[PDB]
Amino acid sequence: VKKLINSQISLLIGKGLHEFDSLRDPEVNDFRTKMRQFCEEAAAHRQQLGWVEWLQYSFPLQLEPNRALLVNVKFEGSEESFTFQVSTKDMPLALMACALRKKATVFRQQPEEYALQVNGRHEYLYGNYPLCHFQYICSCLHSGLTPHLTMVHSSSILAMRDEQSNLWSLEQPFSIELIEGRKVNAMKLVVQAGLFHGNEMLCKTVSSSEVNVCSEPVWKQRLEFDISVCDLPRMARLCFALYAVVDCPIAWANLMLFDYKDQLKTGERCLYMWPSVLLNPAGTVRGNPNTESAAALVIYLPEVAPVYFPALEKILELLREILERELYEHEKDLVWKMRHEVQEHFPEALARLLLVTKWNKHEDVAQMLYLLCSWPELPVLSALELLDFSFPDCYVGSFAIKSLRKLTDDELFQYLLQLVQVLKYESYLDCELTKFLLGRALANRKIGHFLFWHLRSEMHVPSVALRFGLIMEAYCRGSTHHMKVLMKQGEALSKLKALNDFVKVSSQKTTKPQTKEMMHMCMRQETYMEALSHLQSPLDPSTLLEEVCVEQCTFMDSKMKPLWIMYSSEEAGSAGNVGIIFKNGDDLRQDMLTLQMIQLMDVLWKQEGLDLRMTPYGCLPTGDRTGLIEVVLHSDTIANIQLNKSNMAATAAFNKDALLNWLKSKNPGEALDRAIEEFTLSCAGYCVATYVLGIGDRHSDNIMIRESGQLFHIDFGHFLGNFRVPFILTYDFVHVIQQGKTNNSEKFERFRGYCERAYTILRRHGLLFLHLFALMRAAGLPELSCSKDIQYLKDSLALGKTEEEALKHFRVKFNEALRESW
């Protein structure tokens, strides 16, 4: 069984476990043993959960950020059902009460023994919440559908649980010996080396003398640094760049001066370098795994005596307000001087005080750490700032996690992408963040699902494959059952790749209808029917992809030839008619980030009572330039509608009326009014979202509209002004908002109000977007690489301004967009 499980993990994670063994690396070995123990202990806990707690683990509630309604309810075993009129304000318990009373009459004769499953989904309705607080009920109310629910007894829930079981003394100047290298170039070679603590240099950079490009180079020289050995902070990073000159970058490499057990490194090291794009302090501190091909630098660290970093107890032994809302040297001195008062009276200003301490002085670090150990916990917002690479110290990192422990699962989910990216800044394998993420993941299966996919989707990236593979292994140790569920998803993804490759080849030699039929024959093979059917959606575990609907599957006969894959489920009814788009060829990371930021905007708006009728469709990278996008049914591109085809319900005398005609055709009579409203609200949301994020090149073929009237965007390729992008008002959109009238200032200005409201709400959470984007710099997205990218967001949110000035500014941009509008 252990052999089987080991082979299943290897397959699932995309790395053979033997590859970890082969490294013969103590840090790896220790990570694996400790984290396996941690995760297996979490699994033990989980298997004795009460039935309500089990639901909370496996089916966490989907909640929104008087009035009558019809609900259909059945019991688990029978096809018979009852349709009830209840209120939007009624609790699930009241509904379960009517259900059980109805069963007792028909069956000839305790609500608390049950939970309500959404038919054909892994989603449950339970808890003390009015029906309209549940995302599912909320959803039905807007679309018009009747909720379909299933009474599931506690014994059935426990059955699911059960089936799913498993020093201060060293004053000499720091120095190294640069021995030799082995590289490839055209000129002379130089080695630059700097000592870093996060972004900050701990002293000046020091260089080699110029040696000819032939080699196989040899230096054999001591490089001495302007910093005493006792002063080196715990997280000291030593960074190298090898380059050529008559500037031609060649390679770089970083390492920690202390190992994972706090011991100062000695003596010789061989540094397998990473190829270059000079110094890259934020780069990984682990060597290039391609030892066959990588240029290599051998260095020597001298035997200073074995010395370890001092223990905490030994460390513990050893105009203010006007600025405190970049600073001058004298301002820095004041902050440091008043550090006790910072702690006592401005605990939320911790980050500012950290950035003024001299991390290149051990006495000063000791004094900072003493305060930190008594520092009150900070809000979540503040803790996210502390995760930035600017705060490399391990005690600071540990403090950050401690303040982040109060994250709700929903908040954690919202920030998961960024917390995963921050792993790329970690100096060691065993760290507080990994342990935090693993514990949260093991306590909430939705968190576990997305953590898995965020890690799995980067396994083709050498710099993270080891770290991410190890985390995924540990996760599997803590849920054997979820491993098998994830393997089923991976198998479907493997088949989709093979199917897409086939389509790419076939469409080059034949017509689309011919390739489409061939696609269908391929899918109808037993191996494909089996692999593609009956899985949890990678885009949403709550969504069940039962039988694949081959007849309705197709592909886009352009660009990367993405696949359109439809599903149906008898048990889910209408809500089981769902699709996924599989794309191979494009890197989906920036799309996912853009969509997640838009979904965050939607949450913040809803928290202030503004529902802009957004369409946060799923987007998930799964592999190398591979991922999935959630199908939005009953939608079309604006461009297709504007084709203004004849013999259609939307056929228009003037092209400007095509879109309104289409919306009329989908929403006859009194329904037109609501559709125009959904269009106006969503238009405002996306107009504000794309403006703030700096997303240009919006055109008719990358905007879609739903039959409800809701607009949404696709094919984000560019953001943060990498194409200062203007606010955008399209005339055809204004025309719909104005109900087809040439002048309708009443409607148009309501729309302006929505835009301004949306914008002012985002400004109030501006620091959240800035902290999240800062963390995202870890991802290495080329459009999010430097300060100039972050500065775009600062300028778009106008955070240096009063709300009055910002709104004035926004108004000028909005007014400029309206004029531009024909």
Stretch that binds ligand 039, among 202-210, 330-338, 474-482, 623-631 (CB under 6 A): 623-631
Site string for ligand 039, 663-702 (x = CB under 6 A): ----------------------------------------
- What is the nearest approach in angstroms of ligand 039 to the Cβ of residue 617? 5
By beta carbon distance, the residue nearest ligand 039 is 564
DSSP code of residue 550: G
Among 97, 100, 206, 714, binds ligand 039 (CB under 6 A): 714
| Residue 577 binds ligand 039, judged by CB under 6 A | no
Of 80, 112, 226, 636, the one binding ligand 039 (CB under 6 A) is: 636
- For ligand 039, which is the closer residue by CB, 403 or 554? 554
Beta bridge partners of 211: 189
> Binders of ligand 039 among 531-560, rule CB under 6 A?
554-556
**Near ligand 039 by CB under 6 A, which window of 303-311, 384-392, 633-641, 735-743?**
633-641
Binding of residue 190 to ligand 039 (CB under 6 A): no
The least distance separating ligand 039 from the CB of residue 515, rounded to whole angstroms, comes to 12
Of the two residues 357 and 568, which places its CB atom closer to ligand 039 in the complex?
Answer: 568
Q: List the one residue from 581, 687, 688, 692 that touches ligand 039 (CB under 6 A).
A: 581
DSSP for 503-548?
HHHHTTTS-HHHHHHHHHHHHTSHHHHHHHSSEEETTEEEEEE-EE
> Which tokens hold the place of 478?
């803590």
**Strand-strand pairing, 148-153 and 68-75:** parallel
How far apart are the C-alpha atoms of 218 and 76, rounded to whole Å?
Answer: 75
**Cβ neighbourhood burial of 800 (10 Å; 0-12, 13-18, 19+):** exposed
Whichever of 251 and 592 has its CB closer to ligand 039, that residue is: 592
- Confirm or reject binding of residue 228 to ligand 039 (CB under 6 A): no
Concatenated DSSP letters of 83-128: EEEEETT--HHHHHHHHHHHHHHHTT--GGGEEEEETTSS-EE-SS
Q: Which stretch binds ligand 039 (CB under 6 A): 43-51, 207-215, 501-509, 636-644?
A: 636-644
Alpha carbon distance 47, 52 (integer Å): 13
Hey, is 186 helix, strand or coil?
A: coil
Binding segment toward ligand 039, per CB under 6 A, in 216-224, 301-309, 514-522, 635-643: 635-643
Q: How far apart are CA 396 and CA 386, in angstroms?
A: 7
What is the per-residue DSSP string for 319-354? -HHHH-----HHHHHHHHHTHHHHHHH-GGGHHHHH
With 0-12 CB in 10 A as exposed, 13-18 as middle and 19+ as buried, what is 256? middle
Out of 635, 700, 739, 760, which residue is the one contacting ligand 039 (CB under 6 A)? 635
Give the nearest distance from C-beta 586 to ligand 039 in angstroms. 12
Q: Which one of 35, 191, 629, 720 is in contact with ligand 039 (CB under 6 A)? A: 629
Q: If binding means CB under 6 A, how many residues of this protein chain bind ligand 039? A: 16
Of 255 and 601, CB closest to ligand 039: 601
Planar angle of CA 430, 434, 439, nearest 5 degrees: 120
Q: How far is the CB of 714 from ligand 039 (least distance, A)?
A: 5
Closest to 111 measured CA to CA, from 131, 97, 91, 125: 97
Q: Which residues pair with 565 in a beta bridge?
A: 580
Is 268 an interacting residue with respect to ligand 039 (CB under 6 A)?
no
Site string for ligand 039, 495-534 (x = CB under 6 A): ----------------------------------------
Residue 716 is a binding residue for ligand 039 (CB under 6 A): no
> Is the distance from CB of 69 to CB of 88 less than 8 angstroms?
yes
The Cα-based distances of 286 to 269, 427, 437, 614 in angstroms read 12, 8, 22, 42
Among 96, 416, 631, 659, binds ligand 039 (CB under 6 A): 631
**Contact positions toward ligand 039, by CB under 6 A?**
554-556, 562, 564, 581, 617, 629-632, 635-637, 640, 714
